[PDB]
Every structure is written in C-alpha cells, then in structure tokens.
Amino acid sequence: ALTKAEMSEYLFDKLGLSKRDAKELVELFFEEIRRALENGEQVKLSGFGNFDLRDKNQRPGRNPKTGEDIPITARRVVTFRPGQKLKSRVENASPK
DNA sequence: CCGTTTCGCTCAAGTTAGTATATTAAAGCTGAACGAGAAACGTAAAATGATATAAATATCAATATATTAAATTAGATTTTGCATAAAAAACAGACTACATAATACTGTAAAACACAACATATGCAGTCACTATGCCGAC
C-alpha cells in the first residue's frame, strides 16, 4: 500500500531531492490539507478529487451486535468526491 | 469749493566710510540614453458545476478478533571527510654542440658635384600702338 515512506523515496529518485526535504514535503503535503479541512475550507484538487465537509445531524442508530438503539450524535465528517479524471483511471483497475 | 505756495521726493553731481583673495584637489547634482526576468492578461480548451429520481450504495453505533503498515530502535556497513607519502613526471640548474646575427676587414664599382669653355633661348631693356573715356570746351 502506497505510504509516506514510498512517497518520499519516489521524490528522491525522481526529482533528485534529498531524503530530508522529501520526507518533509510529504508530511507538509497532507498536513496543509488537514489544516484546510479543520478550518472549514474545501480542498479542490484538480485531477484527483475534492475533500468536502458535511455537517451531519443527530440520527437514530444502534448496537450492531445486540441491537440496542442508540442515537448517533451529530458531527462534521470529511468526504471525498473522486473527479471524473481519476475515476476513469480506476474503472478498469484490478485488486493487487 | 478751487487756487497758490510750501513741503515731501527723487534725480544728479560731489565728499567719505569699509573691507581684503587665487588656485589647486576632489567631489556632488542631475537631464538623458541604455539593458533583462517575472506576473498580470486574455483567448481557447479541458474539467466541473447544473439538474433531478427511483434504485443502489454508503452512513455508523458498540465490541470481539485476526491482520499489518511502519515508526522505533539496534546493530551492521557502505559512504564520506582528510591526509600521508612515494612512484613518476615536470623543469630549473649546467654545458657542450650547432646554426646564426653583429661585427672585423679586405676588395671594387660608381654615385654626386665642382670646375670651365661655349651655345643661346628667354627675360629684361626700351619705344610705339591698342582701346576708350577723361579734361577741357561748348551747350
């Protein structure tokens, strides 16, 4: 699974950047995104998708195991709407 | 109310009162002509907002249980900063050998011009005409 380690190694042998700046950019990359989502700002990444923020209202829930109905408290979760460009590059994919 | 004469003013020509600099040396000011990189603009193309509805898929609480990416070490090793020193090649420090200019000295033709008797065209020496109104005389 693609992770920080692999991403840093990529920019290393690709852009020719030191492992220091590379490992730092990968962190600041996702960091800046979270700082925009926590503030309430939308993240529109062209050719990749969008990170929306929808405020859900308290709706009825329960205990999947037993079956005790427990109301799910309202909260602001983050969503991800994959663009049409990325989708087309994942349509004929194959789990590996 | 008006006119006439004195007085406040400025122009014009004498009679006095006051202060004193030139080159070096090195800048400093400012009108005008000279020479690139980065971002705001803009038309055009690509991705996305627009739009809605029954059916399909994701939304998620509360907890047991197998799975796994990956920071956290912890020991292994290429990688990296830094000289040390000798084999090997560069290159002044010598020197005779060799071909080459500045110079030493003899050998010979000829440039460059005074000196002197003639030869004679040409400029200078001496006099009259060419070319056209003065001066003098009348109108």
Describe the structure in your own words.
This protein has 96 residues and is α+β, with helices and mostly antiparallel strands. It is 40% helix and 15% strand. It has 3 helices and 4 strands; from the N terminus they run H-H-E-E-E-E-H. A two-stranded antiparallel sheet has the order 1-2. A two-stranded antiparallel ribbon has the order 3-4. Strand 1 and strand 2 (49-51) form a beta hairpin. The longest helix has 21 residues, at 19-39. It is elongated, with a radius of gyration of 19 Å. It binds one DNA strand of 139 nucleotides through loops. It is classed as transferase, hydrolase/dna. Keywords: excision, site-specific recombination, Holliday junction, transferase, HYDROLASE-DNA complex. Lambda excision HJ intermediate. The protein is Integration host factor subunit alpha. Organism: Escherichia coli.
Annotation keywords:
bacteriophage lambda, two-stranded antiparallel sheet, alpha+beta, DNA-binding, transferase, hydrolase/dna, excision, 96 residues, 1 chains, elongated
